[PDB]
């Protein structure tokens, strides 16, 4: 029961900090591509 609740705690707050850095990558490659798109 501890290992099941623990695995659900880990999979939950995994997606919480995964997402926010993955929103930063997907902005960092966009900042470049959007400023290049303005010139293009």
């Amino acid at each position: 029961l501890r290992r099941q609740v623990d695995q659900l705690t880990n999979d939950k707050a995994r997606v919480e900090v995964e997402r926010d850095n993955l929103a930063e990558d997907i902005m960092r490659l966009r900042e470049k591509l959007q400023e290049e798109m303005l010139q293009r």
């Binding site: 623990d6 880990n10 999979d11």
Partner: protein, 51 residues
């Protein structure tokens, strides 16, 4: 996999807490197992042996 593993570090603080009371039930089990050995030693011998 680090957010998983760092939440998993907090899992060992809970699992080490849980296993320290399991090892307390296992210590209580050794104290009951020693009382049962002393009961078994008295229980096998008061009938007076072979005769």
């Amino acid at each position: 996999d680090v957010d998983n593993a760092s939440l998993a570090r907090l899992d060992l603080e809970r699992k080490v807490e849980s296993l320290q009371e399991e090892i307390a039930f296992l210590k209580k089990l050794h104290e009951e197992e020693i009382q049962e050995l002393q009961a078994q030693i008295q229980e096998q011998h008061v009938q007076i042996d072979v005769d």
